[PDB]
């Protein structure tokens, strides 16, 4: 019995050696391996395989998975593979071959009466994204991020207040407690950041004991060497992460003075290119250091013809500068530089910048972390060709390097990779299903802890779920007590030990951060480069080993006008 | 009017079609959501006029051509489905390969 | 450019390789159509299908997973069967086996 | 003192012998009896009857009702009567005459300081509908069904997953637990169905102990004689109902083989006509049997000029058949038959089919169970004239026969008639108020357990609640803790005994199903016919006692374009 | 170091002697005092004052505020002053000078690491409004009132039922319990009113023990002297307030008979002008009495060219009168009088009417209490000029007199002024921030118990929160458990003592009403006038000390077409 | 169409602009929300046409004049900001002092 490869791909999705274009980009993935036994694929439907005594077995619930995603094309940092995925108790159980061991060979994912089916043939499955630069300006950001494929949000804020508009800080025990209570209502995993800017350590320990998983040092609260040293000393004691937005004004010192204050301790540098904030014009040189985990925020990704024009008039409204005063124009030409914006794209392609993030509603777009990551990968393929690590006639390595930037690398940086960040056994089943034509833009299904949380849904009164209008609507995984079971609130070790969850009557599942101080640049998956980088104080030119690092701005991008109504 | 949720939901589809109608009038090549909205709204008005399901399954294939949409848009739309109140109640119209 | 397009490698895939197979002639003696799926225990199909049931014990249709063979009333055809694998335990269907073999 | 009958009807609603047209149909109801004492009617408003010492008495809360619906025209399986309705502790207290026993005669519903008033003069009041074929594809179905007049939803699913798109199954203890938790958030009473397709009884007992009130046997999971026998054996042990979608393919046997496997045990056959699924072409013959409770799903109700055209292209998308392959066209002409669709309408009129249901977003329309039931009654009156049971110059008996199909008969079938399904003393006060011009289409008020849950509501900022735009909006009975007090989650006896409600921290009121195994066709109110029915294997013609059963398709229906914006 | 006053006002908001126009009215406020030390103002932002060691100190959370509103222009009954406002533990901590005592002088509001910042320079801050005439017709009224600047709602009802459409009554223990449970879901503080119309005191005591904070006596339930006496006797025993809508029909007696039944006991007269209800034509004379706290409802505020036309056809639909019957036209000319509507505006200006309120969706507009209060003040300034109490070239006294009508006076009347109603130390931090151009119309931020509850918010996916469309969206203070911590449910003393909050599992913070019986007209802040008022039985002319009290109708108002889309 | 929340939110802005467009056509002087909606919608259509951010920052100042709006409306609008999908992705357009 034989089938043509074209008919096989139409029924079960692609197999080994077949290639798929990602959305409307020039990126092609090639299936590296396929865990099936040809002829034994499981398919659900009228007269299909998954039926009593056939592809479905006689086992009790304890001996089979709760959910199987059939014939998935997995794209993750470790491989691009065709396999079935099994989920049990809200966690990833196995990546392998599903079915009934009574009549089928090589079954590692048993399907029984207790198993639900998601048909993933012809779809791409990825881990849920992790955005670590959220400003909690409004709760509506959670649904916007979730629809985009982001399932964990780390950040700070109290709502639309001046402090939060500017910084990712949830200030003090009272607001930390209230925001942890509000977090139970949102269908994403959440961790909060406290205000790190203080020179008295007890004012920081109080915030960590209240529940924050990190501290943000922001220049708007004074990013001085004394405050940086204080926050890092506390972070080393309490195993939490520090995020930094450095002194753009060079008021307290230059970039080398900030780096000396850090003193080789682990830190996450936000918007490392610098438009989002930081020592002018050379904060970008921080990516050379082994203890620095560098991220980009998204408006500078990728460099386009309209980037500067929006950025030059963005900074003029944010800080109320006005183009009439010469000293404010000199300040505008200080955070906004064509030279560092263009270099940042290349540094992502080389693996010198390790994470992508939004900077939500505070010089960043909450629904565009994933889409912009892929637009940078596309523009780099077009300008630079194949990476040196690339094997075969495909972009598999570039794809693995870029997916790590919004999945596993933010998880490792924030001490939550034991729970989320990748499709690996034992991790929370936060999964995103994509049709290849809409990859990175509009997902087909977003799963939170084993339950569908949001999905495109057609007319509620229709005879099927596909008729128009189709728009994203919350599902059962986003409702009340089911939502509480399917999401995590992350706490510091001190807060968990002190019974913060019981005192505040938090309803969601709780997880604890760990391993924040031992992570270094060498641990960033596929993005561990420490370049010998310099920035010219006069021209702002970025050089790596004396070679100019630059790129050309795009006039048109993929994942843009073909897909969006506005 | 005593609008039910399904009636309010169809107002969203009608509004999205107005956006597309105005862009097509300017001479733009339509994108994916604009094309879906425009064809869907045409079908709902055909049901209101009292056209049959069989007539609309055919007429819906002649609203937009490949020359009026962006590259790849026809392949992104293998079919369009929409329900509306015909004189004989709600019915489903499925238009196969609407853009050629 | 077609968004999400495949570039499928040309060729063929061989199904259920290295497994025991047999061919049986089947005739639908009923007055209503019968359709059988790829993984159904062939010896326990609708009694109106006439064939050597002893030869079909422990076998299923040797066709792509999730496909079917249709038998219109009075239709006769030769089908190819492939042996079950795994534990080779049959439960369900018409309740004729309910155990190993 | 005398008043003309025309002036009386304008002030208090119709009385004995007056007739009312149902919406824009040809159906007329005649008031059979009136429980008032003429001159002693209660009316609320400025200078009206319900006032201290007048129509309102001096009694304490324990001695008066919480809510009175004044001057209601009740339409229920037992009568079409004019009466006041009293509600106390969320339940129906009495059907009778309201007022103050201190000054009024024949008062059976005392009104006191603790009584709220709903003015029902000129309105029709019915029980809330019960839809037993829900696919839990999305939570938005609950508000859509509630707005239509359905207050109880029985079904299965986990969200928009392949298994749920096709079947009413909530598979396994983990998903059953999560869906019971999600049910607290929805303003309808809910019972869940598990996956019945397995040949090992312990895999079924586990699901019933987790909380399901029934098991669905669906052909997409293998509707074989062994799985049917297994599910019925467990149902007989645990007092739960089995719902069946039989083997359309005739893969395991023909309809007579399925009926032999059932072996005279009680079962609910879904979409008994067969377009929705079942032995081709003769599953409809199941309505002859005493142990079968047969329902229809709604796209085939009533038979119209566009029915086939939508159905022939509905099945082609649902199963991905394509009109090019001849064997798929032979399969299309196998579930979709003009002959059985046309016969089904008549079998409803004769009382051979006992229930109506949706099959929500899975070959069925969730907001149209009630509307389509009345469209069938109208088309049958037009084609067939008066029923043999009809007395008087009215359609009272036909109306009682049809209302039973979506109220009491689904309640009896699913073992919940002790709590809901009719306007009878002691039952939960799930009531729907209709203006006669909008009967069956758009209700005036939907009451859940004694509180208004949803209603049309005008401009929130207006000086009155009537100015435009008027659209359905959730009320206090749909909010948080008040919603929990006003809805029921139904559990199996095993789950209630095992403390499932306490373990899952369910917040809503709990009710237990009972009497699922003893109900038979003879118990179906006004719909107990067991016809001697045959289906010709070649032509598909349906005959009862050798007489052809057919009907003509409608070109135009009532309850359609006059009422809906789209 | 010197700065011009114009540059100072642009950076920090106005100071002593500067004037501000309220929205597009002719009302001007003058800054009376400024609590700052010039040069030591706190400002937040990049390179600004509130930074570690500068304007932010080293203190622990217990020693600094949770939130500071910087450079606010406060408008309250006690003054129009420029100051910083500190909030701690959800309550107002201090009105004064914020900063860091380590380097700044005269600091009374310490800012530390635990402090969030709201930038109020150039904004007006007021207390949240208190509407005491709510009909709970639908829950959507809560968001509408909150967006308008009202943070406490007192009223009665059960949803869209005839009793509630007409009266502010929550009848009986069962509905009182359900509405207290529903109140946890709404982002406003709530107190409920029971049905006061009964002549048996135990039927009233039962309702107060169940949780109501007052009793409404409404003519639609019989506003007879026996029912009034009964409700007041119970109110005197249980320290709750009575609200009265008197006998318009003069069925039981005239206004003097109702006043004799009251017998000098404290009572709140709703819609004292009378269009909203009351003895025709002279209920307005009740404002002469020391024990009467008189309010207006809002459709008659101010008198305009369209007032009567809407009111004459409003009463014709509400009571179903019809213009054909002469006795119904005589009834229409009985509640609707040009003479009392025109006099009411003047009586507000003189301080004879003390409160404003809506009468929500029952002859009143829930989102217009504040806007209409300011339109009356504007029309009175235009017609009457300066008040006799006015000092300076400004309208400060008129502004203090009018703001008291919807803030402190409703709070004193209902026994809740210990918790809310003004910007005073120890009170709940329910605060509203306004841009002067939108004062009274569209607020910039609404704070509930120290958390932002609702605010205008731009595109969720935008790079900043200001891009279009900007519309009001709920914030974190309106979500789940954070909402419960930030709102109050008011109970009677009896209900609190009896453990009603624990029995019903109420989740919100609880407060108890007190001091309802001792409040009198002389306690109404800036609105204590007891005029010698008469109404001519034939012409309806209102006279005070024999002088005709009248006003001219407006053809155009401010706070209207310049601001609203419809 | 698979409309995201941000796409649905922009439908509200488009509808508000339709209200304003019809009133301006009647010869009315526009108010504050009408003026904001009309200018914002113009910018979104300019982005759809493929105009640059710099061109729209200037062109947006010539949609409405002081004579077409109510007294005080220009002073109530110091700037208008809106984002839309340009050919090169989402960008922010800020129009300073749009009504003169
Ligand atoms: Ni920053
Ligand atoms: Ni930021
Ligand atoms: Ni079915
Ligand atoms: Ni179904
Ligand atoms: Ni009143
Ligand atoms: Ni009222």
Curated annotation (Swiss-Prot), chains A, D, E:
Q: Which residues form a coiled coil?
A: none
Q: What is its EC number?
A: 3.5.1.5
User: Sites of the modification N6-carboxylysine?
Assistant: 216
Q: Which cofactor does it need?
A: Ni cation
Tell me which residues bind Ni(2+) 1.
133, 135, 216, 359
Annotated effect of mutating residue 319 to A: Reduces activity 100000-fold, but increases KM only 3-fold; optimum pH is 6.75. Resistant to inactivation by diethylpyrocarbonate and iodoacetamide
Q: What is the effect of changing residue 318 to S?
A: Reduces activity 3000-fold, but increases KM only 3.9-fold; optimum pH is 5.2. Reduces binding of nickel ions. Resistant to inactivation by iodoacetamide
Catalytic activity line of the entry: urea + 2 H2O + H(+) = hydrogencarbonate + 2 NH4(+)
What does the UniProt entry list as the effect of changing residue 220 to N?
Reduces activity 50-fold
Q: What are the GO cellular component annotations?
A: cytoplasm
Print the keywords alphabetically: Cytoplasm, Hydrolase, Metal-binding, Nickel
Known regulation of its activity is:
The apoenzyme can be activated in vitro in the presence of nickel ions and carbon dioxide, which promotes carboxylation of Lys-216.
Q: What is the enzyme's main class?
A: hydrolase
Record-linked InterPro entries: Amidohydro-rel, Metal-dep_hydrolase_composite, Metal_Hydrolase, Urease_alpha_N_dom, Urease_alpha_subunit, Urease_AS, Urease_asu, Urease_asu_c
As for pH, the annotation reads: Optimum pH is 7.75.
Question: What is the name attached to this protein's record?
Answer: Urease subunit alpha
Origin organism of this chain?
Klebsiella aerogenes
Organism lineage string: Bacteria, Pseudomonadati, Pseudomonadota, Gammaproteobacteria, Enterobacterales
Q: Which gene encodes it?
A: ureC
UniProtKB/Swiss-Prot annotation, chains B, F:
Catalysis: reaction(s): urea + 2 H2O + H(+) = hydrogencarbonate + 2 NH4(+)
A Gene Ontology biological process in which this protein takes part is: urea catabolic process
**Which GO terms of the molecular function aspect are on file?**
nickel cation binding; urease activity
Report the GO terms under cellular component. Answer: cytoplasm
Q: Where in the cell is it found?
A: Cytoplasm
Describe activity versus pH: Optimum pH is 7.75.
Tell me the enzyme class: hydrolase
UniProt-listed Pfam families? Urease_gamma (PF00547)
Q: Which domain of life is it from?
A: Bacteria
In its keyword annotation, does this UniProt entry include Cytoplasm?
Answer: yes
State which Enzyme Commission number(s) the record gives.
Answer: 3.5.1.5
Q: Does the keyword Thylakoid apply?
A: no
Characterize the regulation of its activity.
The apoenzyme can be activated in vitro in the presence of nickel ions and carbon dioxide, which promotes carbamylation of 'Lys-217' of the UreC (alpha) subunit.
Describe which pathway this protein belongs to, using the record's wording. Answer: Nitrogen metabolism; urea degradation; CO(2) and NH(3) from urea (urease route): step 1/1
The record's note on quaternary structure and interaction partners says:
Heterotrimer of UreA (gamma), UreB (beta) and UreC (alpha) subunits. Three heterotrimers associate to form the active enzyme. The apoenzyme interacts with an accessory complex composed of UreD, UreF and UreG, which is required for the assembly of the nickel containing metallocenter of UreC. The UreE protein may also play a direct role as a metallochaperone in nickel transfer to the urease apoprotein.
Similarity remark: Belongs to the urease gamma subunit family.
User: NCBIfam families attached here?
Assistant: PRK13241.1, urease_gam
Name of this chain's protein: Urease subunit gamma
Organism expressing this protein natively: Klebsiella aerogenes (Enterobacter aerogenes)
From Swiss-Prot, chain C:
Write down the InterPro entries for this protein, in alphabetical order. Answer: Urease_beta-like, Urease_betasu_sf, Urease_subunit
The catalytic activity of this protein is classed by the Enzyme Commission as: 3.5.1.5
Mutation effect (residue 41 to A): Reduces activity by 30% and reduces thermal stability above 50 degrees Celsius
How its function is modulated: the record gives: The apoenzyme can be activated in vitro in the presence of nickel ions and carbon dioxide, which promotes carboxylation of 'Lys-217' of the UreC (alpha) subunit.
Keywords (alphabetical) are: Cytoplasm, Hydrolase
The metabolic or biological pathway listed in the UniProt record of this protein is: Nitrogen metabolism; urea degradation; CO(2) and NH(3) from urea (urease route): step 1/1
Q: Which family is this protein grouped under?
A: Belongs to the urease beta subunit family.
Name under which the protein is recorded: Urease subunit beta
């Amino acid at each position: 019995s034989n089938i043509s490869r074209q008919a096989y791909a139409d029924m079960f999705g692609p197999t080994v050696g077949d290639k798929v274009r990602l959305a409307d980009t020039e990126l092609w993935i090639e299936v590296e391996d396929d865990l099936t036994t040809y002829g034994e694929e499981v398919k659900f439907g009228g007269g299909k395989v998954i039926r009593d005594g056939m592809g479905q077995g006689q086992m009790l619930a304890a001996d089979c998975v709760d959910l199987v995603l059939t014939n998935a094309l997995i794209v993750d940092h470790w491989g691009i593979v065709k396999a079935d995925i099994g989920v049990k108790d809200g966690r990833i159980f196995a990546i392998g071959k599903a079915g009934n061991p009574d009549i089928q060979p090589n079954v590692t994912i048993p399907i029984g009466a207790a198993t639900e089916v998601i048909a993933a043939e012809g779809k791409i499955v990825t881990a849920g994204g992790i955005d670590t630069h959220i400003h909690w300006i409004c709760p509506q950001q959670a649904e916007e991020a979730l629809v985009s494929g982001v399932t964990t949000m780390v950040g700070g804020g109290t709502g639309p207040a001046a402090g939060t508009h500017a910084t990712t800080c949830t200030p003090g025990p009272w607001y930390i407690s209230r925001m942890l209570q509000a977090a139970d209502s949102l269908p994403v995993n959440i961790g909060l950041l406290g205000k790190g800017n203080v020179s008295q350590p007890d004012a920081l320990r109080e915030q960590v004991a209240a529940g924050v998983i990190g501290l943000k040092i922001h220049e708007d609260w004074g990013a001085t060497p004394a405050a940086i040293d204080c926050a890092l000393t506390v972070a080393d004691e309490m195993d939490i992460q520090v995020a930094l937005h450095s002194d753009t004004l060079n008021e307290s010192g230059f970039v080398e003075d900030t780096l000396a204050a850090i003193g080789g301790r682990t830190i996450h540098t936000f918007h490392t290119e610098g438009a989002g904030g930081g020592h002018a014009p050379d904060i970008i040189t921080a990516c050379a250091h082994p203890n620095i985990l560098p991220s980009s925020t998204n408006p500078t990704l990728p460099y386009t013809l309209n980037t500067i024009d929006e950025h030059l008039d963005m900074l003029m409204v944010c800080h109320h500068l006005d183009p009439d005063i010469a000293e404010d124009v000199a300040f505008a030409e200080s955070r906004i530089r064509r030279e560092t914006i263009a270099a940042e794209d290349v540094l992502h392609d080389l693996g010198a910048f390790s994470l992508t993030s939004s900077d939500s509603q505070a010089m960043g777009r909450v629904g565009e972390v994933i889409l912009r990551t892929w637009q940078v990968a596309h523009r780099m393929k077009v300008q630079r060709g194949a990476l040196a690590e690339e094997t075969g006639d495909n972009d598999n390595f570039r794809v693995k390097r870029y997916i790590a930037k919004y999945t596993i690398n933010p998880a490792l940086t924030h001490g939550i990779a034991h729970e989320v960040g990748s499709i690996e056994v034992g991790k929370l089943a936060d999964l995103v299903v994509w049709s290849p034509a809409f990859f990175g833009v509009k997902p087909a299904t977003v799963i939170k802890g084993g339950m569908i949380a949001i999905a495109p849904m057609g007319d509620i009164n229709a005879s099927i779920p596909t008729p128009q209008p189709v728009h994203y609507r919350p599902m059962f995984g986003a409702l009340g007590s089911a939502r509480h079971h399917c999401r995590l609130t992350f706490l510091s070790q001190a807060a968990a030990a002190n019974g913060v969850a019981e005192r505040l009557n938090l309803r969601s599942a709780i997880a604890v951060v760990k391993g924040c101080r031992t992570v270094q640049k060498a641990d960033m998956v596929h993005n561990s480069l420490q370049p010998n980088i310099t920035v010219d104080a006069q021209t702002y030119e970025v050089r790596v080993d004396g070679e100019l690092i630059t790129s050309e701005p795009a006039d048109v991008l993929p994942m843009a006008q073909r897909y969006f109504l506005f | 009017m005593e609008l039910t949720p399904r009636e309010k939901d169809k107002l969203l589809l009608f509004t999205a079609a107005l956006v597309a109608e105005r862009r097509l009038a300017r001479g733009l090549k339509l994108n994916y959501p604009e094309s879906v909205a425009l064809i869907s709204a045409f079908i709902m008005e055909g049901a209101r006029d009292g056209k049959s399901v069989a007539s609309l399954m055919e007429e819906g294939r002649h609203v937009l051509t490949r020359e009026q949409v962006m590259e790849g848009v026809p392949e992104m739309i293998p079919d369009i489905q929409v329900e509306a109140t015909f004189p004989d109640g709600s019915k489903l119209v499925t238009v196969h390969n609407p853009i050629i | 450019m077609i968004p999400g397009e495949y570039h499928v490698k040309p060729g063929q895939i061989a199904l259920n390789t290295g497994r025991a197979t047999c061919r049986v002639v089947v005739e639908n003696h009923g007055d209503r159509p019968i359709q059988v799926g790829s993984h159904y225990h062939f010896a326990e199909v609708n009694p109106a299908l006439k064939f050597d049931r002893q030869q079909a014990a422990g076998y299923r249709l040797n066709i792509p997973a999730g496909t079917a063979v249709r038998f219109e009333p009075g239709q006769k055809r030769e089908v190819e069967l492939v042996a079950f694998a795994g534990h080779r335990a049959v439960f369900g269907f018409r309740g004729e086996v309910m155990g190993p073999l």
